[PDB]
Design an enzyme around this catalytic site. Sequence first.
Site, PDB file in Angstrom:
ATOM      1  N   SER B  42      28.957  49.160  86.933  1.00 23.39           N
ATOM      2  CA  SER B  42      28.838  48.094  85.945  1.00 23.39           C
ATOM      3  C   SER B  42      27.754  47.156  86.472  1.00 23.39           C
ATOM      4  O   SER B  42      27.634  46.944  87.676  1.00 23.39           O
ATOM      5  CB  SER B  42      30.177  47.366  85.762  1.00 23.39           C
ATOM      6  OG  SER B  42      30.925  47.342  86.966  1.00 23.39           O
ATOM      7  N   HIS B 156      37.939  51.606  78.983  1.00 24.42           N
ATOM      8  CA  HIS B 156      38.571  52.544  79.891  1.00 24.42           C
ATOM      9  C   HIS B 156      39.252  53.744  79.242  1.00 24.42           C
ATOM     10  O   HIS B 156      39.292  54.827  79.832  1.00 24.42           O
ATOM     11  CB  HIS B 156      39.572  51.815  80.780  1.00 24.42           C
ATOM     12  CG  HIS B 156      38.998  51.392  82.093  1.00 24.42           C
ATOM     13  ND1 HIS B 156      37.719  51.729  82.481  1.00 24.42           N
ATOM     14  CD2 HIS B 156      39.527  50.680  83.114  1.00 24.42           C
ATOM     15  CE1 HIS B 156      37.485  51.241  83.684  1.00 24.42           C
ATOM     16  NE2 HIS B 156      38.565  50.601  84.092  1.00 24.42           N
ATOM     17  N   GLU B 165      43.223  46.670  81.820  1.00 20.60           N
ATOM     18  CA  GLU B 165      44.317  47.090  82.700  1.00 20.60           C
ATOM     19  C   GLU B 165      45.664  46.424  82.440  1.00 20.60           C
ATOM     20  O   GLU B 165      45.744  45.249  82.083  1.00 20.60           O
ATOM     21  CB  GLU B 165      43.982  46.787  84.164  1.00 20.60           C
ATOM     22  CG  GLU B 165      42.722  47.380  84.750  1.00 20.60           C
ATOM     23  CD  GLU B 165      42.386  46.724  86.086  1.00 20.60           C
ATOM     24  OE1 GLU B 165      43.314  46.189  86.730  1.00 20.60           O
ATOM     25  OE2 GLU B 165      41.209  46.740  86.502  1.00 20.60           O
ATOM     26  N   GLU B 208      41.562  54.912  88.071  1.00 20.03           N
ATOM     27  CA  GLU B 208      42.461  54.204  88.974  1.00 20.03           C
ATOM     28  C   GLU B 208      43.867  54.778  89.119  1.00 20.03           C
ATOM     29  O   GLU B 208      44.757  54.100  89.627  1.00 20.03           O
ATOM     30  CB  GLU B 208      42.567  52.740  88.559  1.00 20.03           C
ATOM     31  CG  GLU B 208      41.279  51.971  88.707  1.00 20.03           C
ATOM     32  CD  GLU B 208      41.386  50.566  88.166  1.00 20.03           C
ATOM     33  OE1 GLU B 208      42.299  49.827  88.592  1.00 20.03           O
ATOM     34  OE2 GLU B 208      40.552  50.203  87.314  1.00 20.03           O
ATOM     35  N   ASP B 243      44.611  42.623  82.999  1.00 23.17           N
ATOM     36  CA  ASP B 243      43.179  42.428  83.161  1.00 23.17           C
ATOM     37  C   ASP B 243      42.637  42.683  81.767  1.00 23.17           C
ATOM     38  O   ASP B 243      42.502  43.829  81.336  1.00 23.17           O
ATOM     39  CB  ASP B 243      42.566  43.414  84.155  1.00 23.17           C
ATOM     40  CG  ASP B 243      41.095  43.116  84.429  1.00 23.17           C
ATOM     41  OD1 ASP B 243      40.719  41.924  84.405  1.00 23.17           O
ATOM     42  OD2 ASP B 243      40.319  44.060  84.681  1.00 23.17           O
ATOM     43  N   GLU B 284      44.020  38.459  84.137  1.00 22.67           N
ATOM     44  CA  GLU B 284      42.643  38.517  84.622  1.00 22.67           C
ATOM     45  C   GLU B 284      41.663  38.523  83.454  1.00 22.67           C
ATOM     46  O   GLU B 284      41.871  39.231  82.464  1.00 22.67           O
ATOM     47  CB  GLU B 284      42.436  39.771  85.475  1.00 22.67           C
ATOM     48  CG  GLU B 284      41.179  39.726  86.335  1.00 22.67           C
ATOM     49  CD  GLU B 284      40.971  40.986  87.163  1.00 22.67           C
ATOM     50  OE1 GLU B 284      41.953  41.493  87.748  1.00 22.67           O
ATOM     51  OE2 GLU B 284      39.817  41.457  87.241  1.00 22.67           O
ATOM     52  N   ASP B 311      37.214  37.271  87.368  1.00 23.90           N
ATOM     53  CA  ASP B 311      36.540  38.479  87.833  1.00 23.90           C
ATOM     54  C   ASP B 311      35.124  38.494  87.265  1.00 23.90           C
ATOM     55  O   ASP B 311      34.162  38.298  88.001  1.00 23.90           O
ATOM     56  CB  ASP B 311      37.310  39.732  87.407  1.00 23.90           C
ATOM     57  CG  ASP B 311      36.608  41.013  87.811  1.00 23.90           C
ATOM     58  OD1 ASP B 311      36.108  41.088  88.953  1.00 23.90           O
ATOM     59  OD2 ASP B 311      36.561  41.948  86.989  1.00 23.90           O
ATOM     60  N   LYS B 336      36.135  41.053  95.615  1.00 21.88           N
ATOM     61  CA  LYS B 336      35.486  42.350  95.726  1.00 21.88           C
ATOM     62  C   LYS B 336      34.355  42.203  96.733  1.00 21.88           C
ATOM     63  O   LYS B 336      33.289  41.684  96.388  1.00 21.88           O
ATOM     64  CB  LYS B 336      34.917  42.775  94.373  1.00 21.88           C
ATOM     65  CG  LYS B 336      35.957  43.214  93.361  1.00 21.88           C
ATOM     66  CD  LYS B 336      35.317  43.502  92.015  1.00 21.88           C
ATOM     67  CE  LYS B 336      36.326  44.079  91.036  1.00 21.88           C
ATOM     68  NZ  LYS B 336      35.720  44.324  89.699  1.00 21.88           N
ATOM     69  N   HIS B 364      39.995  46.674  94.811  1.00 25.12           N
ATOM     70  CA  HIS B 364      39.188  47.867  94.977  1.00 25.12           C
ATOM     71  C   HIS B 364      38.088  47.824  93.927  1.00 25.12           C
ATOM     72  O   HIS B 364      37.826  46.781  93.335  1.00 25.12           O
ATOM     73  CB  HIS B 364      40.070  49.086  94.708  1.00 25.12           C
ATOM     74  CG  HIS B 364      40.729  49.062  93.361  1.00 25.12           C
ATOM     75  ND1 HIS B 364      41.598  50.044  92.936  1.00 25.12           N
ATOM     76  CD2 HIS B 364      40.637  48.176  92.337  1.00 25.12           C
ATOM     77  CE1 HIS B 364      42.010  49.767  91.710  1.00 25.12           C
ATOM     78  NE2 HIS B 364      41.441  48.638  91.323  1.00 25.12           N
ATOM     79  N   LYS B 387      44.979  44.591  94.762  1.00 19.72           N
ATOM     80  CA  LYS B 387      45.017  45.542  93.678  1.00 19.72           C
ATOM     81  C   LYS B 387      44.099  46.716  94.016  1.00 19.72           C
ATOM     82  O   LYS B 387      42.869  46.619  93.984  1.00 19.72           O
ATOM     83  CB  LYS B 387      44.701  44.866  92.331  1.00 19.72           C
ATOM     84  CG  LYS B 387      43.274  44.764  91.894  1.00 19.72           C
ATOM     85  CD  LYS B 387      43.248  44.596  90.386  1.00 19.72           C
ATOM     86  CE  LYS B 387      41.838  44.572  89.841  1.00 19.72           C
ATOM     87  NZ  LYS B 387      41.822  44.509  88.356  1.00 19.72           N
TER      88      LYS B 387
END
Lengths: 422, 422
Positions: B42, B156, B165, B208, B243, B284, B311, B336, B364, B387
């Site tokens: 990304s 996703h 998520e 994931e 998220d 998130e 994020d 991150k 991650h 996470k």
Amino acid sequence: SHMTIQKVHGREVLDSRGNPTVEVEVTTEKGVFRSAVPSGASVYEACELRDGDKKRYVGKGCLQAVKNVNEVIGPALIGRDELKQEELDTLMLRLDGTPNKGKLGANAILGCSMAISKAAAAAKGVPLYRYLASLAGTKELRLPVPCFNVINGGKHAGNALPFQEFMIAPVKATSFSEALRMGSEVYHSLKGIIKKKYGQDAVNVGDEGGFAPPIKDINEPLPILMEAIEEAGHRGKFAICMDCAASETYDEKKQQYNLTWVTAEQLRETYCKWAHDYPIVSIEDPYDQDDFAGFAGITEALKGKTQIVGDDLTVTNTERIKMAIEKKACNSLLLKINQIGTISEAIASSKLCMENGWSVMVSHRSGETEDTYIADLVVALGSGQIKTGAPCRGERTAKLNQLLRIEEELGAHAKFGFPGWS
Amino acid sequence: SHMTIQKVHGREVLDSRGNPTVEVEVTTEKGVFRSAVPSGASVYEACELRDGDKKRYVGKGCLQAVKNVNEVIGPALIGRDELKQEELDTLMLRLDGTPNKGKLGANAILGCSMAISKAAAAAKGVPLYRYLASLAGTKELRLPVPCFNVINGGKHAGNALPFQEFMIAPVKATSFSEALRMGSEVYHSLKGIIKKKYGQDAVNVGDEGGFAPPIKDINEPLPILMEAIEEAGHRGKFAICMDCAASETYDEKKQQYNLTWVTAEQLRETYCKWAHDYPIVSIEDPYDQDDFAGFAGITEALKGKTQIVGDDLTVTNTERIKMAIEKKACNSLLLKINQIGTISEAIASSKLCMENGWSVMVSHRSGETEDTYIADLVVALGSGQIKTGAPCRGERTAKLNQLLRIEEELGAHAKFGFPGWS
Ligand SMILES: [Zn+2]
Ligand SMILES: [Zn+2]
Ligand SMILES: [Zn+2]
Ligand SMILES: [Zn+2]
């Protein structure tokens, strides 16, 4: 004395599917050496001891196996010379006392056998794959051709597809680096091809990193793999390896293969047609675990063109392997260390097979971990054939990365691939 | 002198999705220390240098980043004292000379920063997490509550689901062992629930490890997660973390959220309703990367009940973090390491946030490796929130297993969880 085994400790850890498995650590003056046991989630195999306590992990706990490591094996190993692989592995076999490692558990003994070999290698001052090669008396090390799992069927996919695995292998690559790259690029062309012909919600992956597209047709997978190879830009550089797992669709009550209903000779047909038209250089479990007659009949038939790999047939079992060798039921042995139990026996089985003209394909298990032992192992046996999944998912890529590290360490002259497929 | 850095070498390896990334090894008298860089696939992030050569890995090669390690950074590190983290990290920042690490590459500097800290920890004679805690001045170590990724949507999944998520977290667990087990058992109940309500060809997993069921309805995911928790046998012991990645459905041209069309205040609604009815303790990116006004408005609203995690808002960026801190745009920082570039800066950002009452969630990246650095990191910062994915897939489980090893090493009195969620 000094450079001796000082501590042995086991613990429960999770494998790539969220199920517990065993991990063992062997501490010596030179450090901590840890190895984790694979799990296949599936009679001839060495016993995998589970707790069976529905209160934990749905009865899949490995506390009993860990306990056997911490309380029985470990204390017998304290003070011992880790250089004596065969001696220590034999001790553990004798500690268990049963032909199938049912008292202590194959998943208890294996972690120890592995970690011991790692500690011994360090004590010697050479990487694991080198120590194992001398142990196996291997004359020439070599990086294996990776057979990547890319299309799932049978019990593996909620598919209309009966057969299990469909793999692609960069047989014409001149190095593992190039091999891994090609495999990766094709894997990505495939992802895009499948997303177009089945949809976005069709590229999610199975336990081994491959895809389980809604393939509702049986002569569809092969052509799609050729197309992906073509598009990636590697036309003519790949071969195909299949794992039929024919037992999953065979019932003697009928002596049938419900693919619809087909029989053996009427199956040896589809195979031959696929091995004549496509570059399928290896077929795993083309028949049921006991259809020896059918096994040897497809082995001499496709001989020289397509190796027949035994898995549910040999089950990495000593007795089972000799029965196969005698009846020429196959010519390739899939090597799963946790199906036998110790490294000495695993290496013994590989040598026995290679001595009889057989090839050896070192493989992972449905449930793997971040462990990378089989990477050094396949190189140490110099077989040139390994199957650790698609170039996707950490428990698969960890091995592929270890192979990259081993190649770099060996140098430009390092040998690559299976000579019969190059 | 003696205990100095002797060799620095980088190489290309594959991450959990088959894409190349950087791995660095720092050799000292005490051994070889290797660290691999994550990748998120990304603007505010530190530069990730790719080759852009369509001939290799579809232009995703990391040869330039590896080369920068082997030819620029490595030689400047030879002979240096690896104990000086801040000094060595500062040197690399200065070697690059650009605010975004665009000359050498964040994926070139990070591997070095990480491996250096590992070599220094060994030189000191303490595990990584202990060395990092002293480095961060952390007063109390603690095992984090793992927030497991179980249901995918938005970009996703080829879903009808917009948000990204959906996670479950064993907040009431009393130890990481129990936490990991509970998370695992629920993950399995979920697999069975989804297979019943969507089909076998619906349990394959995303990047994931979580599931991407064909959820064609928006108020379906939460109830299904409660049902799975219930069935696993852990009713009332879990919480939920979301998220939204709200940017993926927002266009200012419209100042819209196409979920159909909804706006912010008409979004802060769905959130509140879900945070009032379900045990959602963390959200998130509820809004777009720049809707500060909306960000701080949902932060004081759900305050005390639901933390708001930045994020795409903070992008682990120093300047970005301070803008958020000032406007109270959120109260939780997703950490991150590869978005910033060095460990000194990563730790600096965590401390700055915690000093302002914020919580920190170490995470991650979409593309991980068998690397387990963030396991020791989350414990070293004592944040109690990490996470690393569902308890599925090796690049995720490797971290979860490392946390198990850290807990065992700390002892029965080791602290577990996030105090605000217990
Ligand atoms: Zn399989
Ligand atoms: Zn098989
Ligand atoms: Zn995600
Ligand atoms: Zn996010």
